[PDB]
């Protein structure tokens, strides 16, 4: 298209910024990147969702300092996928959002888990499984609420109209 094409690129730029940041205390602080991945899925996905998701996860990890691993960009792809199927061309719902975030959280923590347990690092699977499932079970209700408030804000709606 073009406007859709450009706006998505802008969102990708937006995603990188928020990725430089976190809110929290010690070294338990979470990024809000999931917001942008949900946004794009809702307005564009899942075809464009997965594509952009892939590009941002890769261009992103590479630019920060982190270790390239094709499975993470896979992991990124499923998220934009789960979001879009739940959130694409559908009215926003508490369950819609809830089910999307939960289906993701169990692959933000299972699928993501093996990816480092695999050959990247040796780290024992069934022993890290708790710590992730612990950590990413308390960010979840935040992510649920936030995604909901983002998509039903008057700002997003305002723009959503302008894109249609």
């Amino acid at each position: 298209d073009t406007l859709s094409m450009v706006t998505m690129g802008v969102l990708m730029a937006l995603q990188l910024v928020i990725s430089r940041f976190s809110v929290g205390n010690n070294f338990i602080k979470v990024s809000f990147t999931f917001l942008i991945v949900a946004l794009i899925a809702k307005w564009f996905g899942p075809w464009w969702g997965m594509l952009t998701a892939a590009v941002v996860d890769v261009i992103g990890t590479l630019m920060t300092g982190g270790p390239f691993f094709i499975g993470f960009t896979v992991s990124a792809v499923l998220g934009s996928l789960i979001y879009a199927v739940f959130l694409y061309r559908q009215p926003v719902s508490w369950w819609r959002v809830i089910g999307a975030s939960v289906l993701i959280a169990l692959l933000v923590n299972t699928l993501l888990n093996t990816l480092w347990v695999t050959i990247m690092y040796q780290t024992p699977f069934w022993s890290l499984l708790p710590v992730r499932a612990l950590k990413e079970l308390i960010v979840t209700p935040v992510q649920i609420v936030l995604v909901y408030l983002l998509l039903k804000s008057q700002v997003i709606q305002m723009i959503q109209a302008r894109l249609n």
């Binding site: 690129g9 990708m12 990188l16 070294f27 261009i59 300092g65 690092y121 780290t123 804000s153």
Partner: protein
């Protein structure tokens, strides 16, 4: 973008799309390496690389920081549980600890030795044959390009919004966690709009300049394979044939 790609003239530092493949192949060598003499090699070239790249002190150490997380959690949990520690188990740490460094210090190198713009110019190459699987590479190459030129402006903008809100109450990072989040709204809601407004303005202007499709146009940005593109890849491969042996 992350004050990284430091200009070092002396270091061999060229041919990007070599390094992307190189940083992407380097992991498969790691677990291809099983033995012990094999490990010597995987340090040999990796040292050679790190050294030759004139990139200095705790840069690589500052790469290690965010993963201390695991590095301790791993090695400790592999010392106990192998609570009795075998003579062999300490030996394992010599793997994993070394192995952990090898991953971290390699990927750190790539980021430190390449401009993101050049990285971007480079990925677009090594995806170009995905067209034959019907993947819109050129438009994606455009999306990213847009994405990379907006990053600094959105950053400059994010700070101005923050300042302005600060200049009328709002304490960024103060007095809570809900309160701390609740205050992100005066930053975020405006930023989005600025972005989408910027989007629209840019798209029309792009159209005013001739545009219609990602495809059916040229590349002013050109990548030149050179002398090193070839040899700094054999040097990897003489290392790799050894890992077999």
């Amino acid at each position: 973008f992350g004050r990284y790609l430091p200009l070092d003239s002396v270091v061999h530092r060229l041919d990007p799309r070599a390094k992307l493949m190189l940083s992407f192949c380097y992991i498969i060598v790691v677990f291809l390496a099983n033995n012990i003499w094999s490990y010597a090699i995987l340090i040999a070239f990796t040292v050679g690389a790190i050294l030759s790249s004139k990139i200095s002190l705790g840069f690589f150490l500052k790469g290690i920081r965010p993963l201390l997380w695991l590095i301790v959690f791993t090695v400790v949990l592999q010392l106990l549980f192998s609570i009795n520690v075998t003579q062999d188990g300490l030996i394992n740490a010599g793997y994993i600890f070394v192995r952990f460094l090898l991953i971290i210090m390699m990927s750190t190198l790539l980021t430190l030795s390449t401009q993101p713009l050049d990285i971007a110019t480079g990925l677009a190459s090594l995806m170009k044959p995905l067209r034959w699987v019907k993947v819109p590479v050129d438009t994606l190459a455009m999306m990213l390009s847009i994405a990379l030129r907006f990053v600094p402006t959105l950053m400059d903008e994010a700070t101005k919004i923050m300042n302005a809100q600060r200049a009328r109450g709002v304490d960024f990072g103060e007095g809570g966690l809900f309160k701390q989040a609740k205050s992100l709204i005066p930053l975020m809601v405006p930023l989005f709009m600025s972005a989408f407004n910027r989007a629209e303005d840019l798209s029309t202007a792009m159209e005013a300049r001739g545009y219609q499709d990602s495809e059916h146009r040229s590349q002013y940005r050109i990548l030149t394979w050179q002398r090193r593109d070839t040899v700094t890849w054999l040097l990897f491969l003489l290392g790799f044939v050894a890992i077999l042996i």
